Design a binder for this molecule. Structure first.
Ligand SMILES: CC(C)N(c1cc(-c2ccccc2)sc1C(=O)O)C(=O)[C@H]1CC[C@H](C)CC1
Length: 559
């Protein structure tokens, strides 16, 4: 069927939309070529629509039915708990889009009688009505990027806050446990950056002659069919569920997950959806399962050898036993034809790679650096263009989410995150003393409220002391960063070193934790550097739950 149908009404914004980076003193320090940074707006929704709208082609086969059964078999071991209204409400982000029924996120978290009564009614309605499509709002997603040698905005579709709270009750436990029980080590979100690097290396070194490739599905969401969504529910249905949880999942599947009407911000009827809605709790899990299923089956159809998959929602990387240059190009092409039949056509054609560092998955790639000792240490890095553009944007304007804080946590070991991001921001934060102001950022979709003064502990727990001494990065890595700093017009190492030394000092100076920041995060700043040792408070932080499952668009907030 058509992934989308449109009435012709427009996808509208519910407020004004900024697209250009503002001329700002504090923002010019970091990035100079401001006219290169932009934000997507609804003004380009139509371009995205034309690209996501089309009629899906899908042909299942024995390999597909076989992998599905293997997956359903493992799903059978799971027992999922029904979440209480209180626990569900406790998972709702503080600034989640309010309900159109007279209450918002604040009330939901407070457990106010009004928000709770409505959630129950929405739940009762789920147990009783198994057909009526549930309404969803469509909006153009606002994302910053850097011009290219632009990008039309991504589309987001989500239901009312009431329903979202119900999803959590019926499915939170399922989407957080199942992926893991079904795909095992292949499930990406169970890994912190370091562990992913480790899995990618151990998987790589386990083959005699490794051959890997990343696989980019063209607008994965619009490629998800009604069959895929029922196949996905068929997997959930294998869990031991509470009766109401089972009705809720059956009803959420027919009334929301497979499709439904689309309403813009103005109340108008925009059209209909018959594919994955990016804004429901099951998006991340559903996609990870679907992508894993099609890839695992496709790998058998293409005669690829020793298929080790790594899946993160729609992002997919494959590492396997090479069979020869020619043979691998043929096997890989066969793989794409298989995925195309299962309705996962390629965006950019996959390319076999024989150098791990040359593989981009989750917009990242593994790379080598050296620590104080001089021993080789692997870390996860990525082209810094987008992280930096976004940092500039987050410096010039005020935003709910702080990607820089999230990028510093996920990429603390990188040359760019420490040199630029840490220096830039800690400098700005001190100059307004807000090192204690907790900020919100995201990790695998989930929203987190993190304190900037706790970054040393976090970096040591997640990446290890080496992250503070990495040096002698790879040739490829410095080229990228160089090329990047040249492009956006960012001041050279010389300038950052100088700014860091100034931040370090004013940090060691003022106090305790802040001094810890200066001593650890900026140890690369001084020549007569202090010998770094394990930070006590580190093993005190509850990093449980940080890397268990993906929640992109799932409206989740961990406290
Ligand atoms: C002087 C040199 C030893 N160096 C270095 C600069 C590179 C750089 C490359 C491209 C653009 C800007 C800087 S790479 C590279 C390295 O260690 O290989 C360093 O000391 C850095 C300084 C920044 C620290 C976050 C990590 C350590």
């Amino acid at each position: 069927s058509m992934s989308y149908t449109w009435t012709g009404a427009l996808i509208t914004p519910c407020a004004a939309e900024e697209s250009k980076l503002p001329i700002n003193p504090l923002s010019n320090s970091l990035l100079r070529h401001h006219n290169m940074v932009y934000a997507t707006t609804s003004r380009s929704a139509s371009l995205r629509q034309k690209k996501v709208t089309f009629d899906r082609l899908q042909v299942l086969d024995d390999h597909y039915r076989d992998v599905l059964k293997e997956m359903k078999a493992k799903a059978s071991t799971v027992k999922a708990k029904l979440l209480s209204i209180e626990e569900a409400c406790k998972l709702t982000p503080p600034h989640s889009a309010k309900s159109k029924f007279g209450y918002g996120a604040k009330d939901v978290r407070n457990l106010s009688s009004r928000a709770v009564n409505h959630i129950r009614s929405v739940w009762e309605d789920l147990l009783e009505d198994t057909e009526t499509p549930i309404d969803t709002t469509i909006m153009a997603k606002s994302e910053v990027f850097c011009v290219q040698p632009r990008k039309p905005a991504r589309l987001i579709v989500f239901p009312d806050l009431g329903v979202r709270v119900c999803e959590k009750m019926a499915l939170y436990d399922v989407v957080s446990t199942l992926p893991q029980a079904v795909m095992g080590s292949s499930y990406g979100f169970q890994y912190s950056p370091k562990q992913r690097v480790e899995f990618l290396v151990n998987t790589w070194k386990s083959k005699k002659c490794p051959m890997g490739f990343s696989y980019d599905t063209r607008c994965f969401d619009s490629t998800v069919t009604e069959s895929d969504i029922r196949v996905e529910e068929s997997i959930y249905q294998c869990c031991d569920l509470a009766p109401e949880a089972r009705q809720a999942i059956r009803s959420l599947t027919e009334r929301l997950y497979i499709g439904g009407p689309l309403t813009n911000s103005k109340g108008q009827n925009c059209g209909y959806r018959r594919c994955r809605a990016s804004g429901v709790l099951t998006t991340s899990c559903g996609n990870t399962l679907t992508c894993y299923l099609k890839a695992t089956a496709a790998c058998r159809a293409a005669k690829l050898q020793d298929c080790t998959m790594l899946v993160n929602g729609d992002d997919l990387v494959v590492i396997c036993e090479s069979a020869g240059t020619q043979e691998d190009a043929a096997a890989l092409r066969a793989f794409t034809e298989a995925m195309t039949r299962y309705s996962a056509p390629p965006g950019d054609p996959p390319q076999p790679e024989y150098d791990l560092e040359l593989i981009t998955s989750c917009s990242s790639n593994v790379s080598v650096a050296h620590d104080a000792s001089g021993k080789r240490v692997y870390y996860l890095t990525r082209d810094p263009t987008t992280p930096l553009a976004r940092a500039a944007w987050e410096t010039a304007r005020h935003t709910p989410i702080n990607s820089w804080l999230g990028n510093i946590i996920m990429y603390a070991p990188t040359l760019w995150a420490r040199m630029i991001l840490m220096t830039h921001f800690f400098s700005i934060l001190l100059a307004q003393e807000q090192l204690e102001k907790a900020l919100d950022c995201q990790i695998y979709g989930a929203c987190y409220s993190i304190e900037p003064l706790d970054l040393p502990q976090i970096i040591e727990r997640l990446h290890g002391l080496s992250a503070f001494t990495l040096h002698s990065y790879s040739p490829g890595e410095i080229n990228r960063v160089a090329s990047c700093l040249r492009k956006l017009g960012v001041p050279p190492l010389r300038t950052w070193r100088h700014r860091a030394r100034s931040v370090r000092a004013k940090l060691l100076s003022q106090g305790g934790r802040a001094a810890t920041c200066g001593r650890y995060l900026f140890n690369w700043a001084v020549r007569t550097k202090l010998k770094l040792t394990p930070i006590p408070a580190a093993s005190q932080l509850d990093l449980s739950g940080w890397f268990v499952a993906g929640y992109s668009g799932g409206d989740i907030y961990h406290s």
